[PDB]
């Protein structure tokens, strides 16, 4: 029960930047803190131990400081291979515990999304279900709000969304949101709309279609 709190939970940085991530323990752990890097789908890699000691084979741009309850991992000239998630781990006493992680992401300029809406197919409807999809293409930063309206009524609890990792070419995100209704419910309404709010837009953008007209 030594709780580790990392901050921030995420940050955006550029190649060349000096990045600092902090770890705080709920009580003193002396120097007994380690740092790990993890990339999506891969196992963690040890970077630093005993607060300040560099693990064999790790680039010296990684360094650690602190003692007691306050610790920092510093990456002094961030490289393309360093975009990843980082975790602290205390080793003062069992049980070993980890911080919740800090995701280091790629900074770029604001980019508004292009927005598209797709009606359900006749083949899906035959099976009794209607999925309506809204796509937000190539935007930055990640923060976005997608709101579904049916007959101009805001929807709740009937949609799911997911987001890609940053694009390898332009460092943007894309997002897909699916609104799911039964066929009978889909057919009783007229207007289907998705409303998008994002930093890159001066006002929310709405894409919509009308059943019977689409």
């Amino acid at each position: 029960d030594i709780q580790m709190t990392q901050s921030p939970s995420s940050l955006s940085a550029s190649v060349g930047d000096r990045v600092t991530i902090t770890c705080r323990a709920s009580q003193s752990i002396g120097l007994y803190l380690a740092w790990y890097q993890q990339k999506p789908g891969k196992a963690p890699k040890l970077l630093i131990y005993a607060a300040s000691s560099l693990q064999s084979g790790v680039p010296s741009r990684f360094s650690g400081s602190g003692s007691g309850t306050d610790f920092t991992l510093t990456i002094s000239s961030l490289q393309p291979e360093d975009f990843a998630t980082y975790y602290c781990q205390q080793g003062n006493t069992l049980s070993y515990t980890f911080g919740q992680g800090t995701k280091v992401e790629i900074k770029r300029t604001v980019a508004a999304p292009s927005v598209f809406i797709f009606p359900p197919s006749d083949e899906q409807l035959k099976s009794g279900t209607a999925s309506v999809v809204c796509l937000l293409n190539n935007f930055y930063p990640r923060e976005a709000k997608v709101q579904w309206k049916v007959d101009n009524a805001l929807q709740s609890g009937n949609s799911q969304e997911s987001v890609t990792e940053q694009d390898s070419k332009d460092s943007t995100y894309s997002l897909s949101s699916t609104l799911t209704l039964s066929k009978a419910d889909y057919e009783k309404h007229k207007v289907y709309a998705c409303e998008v709010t994002h930093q890159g837009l001066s006002s929310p953008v709405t894409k919509s279609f009308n059943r019977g007209e689409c």
């Binding site: 120097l31 007994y32 292009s114 699916t178 689409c214």
Partner: protein, 225 residues
């Protein structure tokens, strides 16, 4: 090299038992402790417990105490993690890791590649594939989007290509979402020149190894309005 290699991905139902393995090589297996770590979908790392292979002395996190058993067969340099009865909530990536005591603390210096364990009452099922295409009078720019919705399959993953792999630029294949049905759904989209709509054909190709199925879908809006 110091190496830990874990047993392969598992797909199980709730209530079933499971034992996964971690074989170490390139070092004296009995001189180093092995730890087990859990990483649930989209979450951080959790220490589960450790074992000293030289005498099988174990420690568990209080969270995991009584729910899993860590063991070792030092004669074959293997460590194990096991459940008598799985639950859906046990769905996660599991790592084994070697402990190296340096700077007077235990550190996880070498890690296995991970073992993905999926626990669900769902049964194997191939996806249905539906087109995503805009309404007839909706293409308002020089760039249009098309896609396909890959719905109601189990387990992960599916692979999606476009025009047999000829089309890769501007393709976005999203993370699957787990529906309340216990089945997954994902979408794959591509942006293309508005001028190519009708002149060029766009087909998504959807492979699902677990069900041994493949579905192609030519994408267009079939207009009756």
């Amino acid at each position: 090299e110091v190496q830990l290699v874990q047993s392969g991905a598992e797909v199980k139902k709730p209530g079933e038992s499971l034992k996964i393995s971690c074989k170490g090589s390139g070092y004296s297996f009995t001189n180093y402790w092995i730890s087990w770590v859990r990483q649930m979908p989209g979450k951080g790392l959790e220490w589960m417990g450790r074992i000293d292979p030289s005498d099988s002395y174990t420690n568990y996190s209080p969270s995991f105490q009584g729910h899993v058993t860590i063991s070792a067969d030092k004669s074959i340099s293997t460590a194990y993690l096991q459940w008598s009865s799985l639950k859906a909530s046990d769905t996660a990536m599991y790592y084994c890791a070697r402990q190296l005591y340096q700077g007077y603390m235990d550190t996880f210096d070498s890690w296995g590649q991970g073992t993905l364990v999926t626990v669900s009452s769902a049964s194997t099922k191939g996806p249905s594939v539906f087109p995503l295409a805009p309404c007839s009078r909706s293409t308002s720019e020089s760039t249009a989007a098309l896609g396909c919705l890959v719905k109601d399959y189990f387990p992960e993953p599916v692979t999606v290509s476009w025009n047999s792999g000829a089309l890769t630029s501007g393709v976005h294949t999203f993370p699957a979402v787990l529906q309340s049905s216990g089945l997954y759904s994902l979408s794959s989209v591509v942006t293309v020149p508005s001028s190519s709509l009708g002149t060029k054909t766009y087909t998504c190709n959807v492979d699902h190894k677990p069900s041994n199925t493949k579905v192609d879908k030519r994408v267009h809006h079939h207009h009756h309005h």
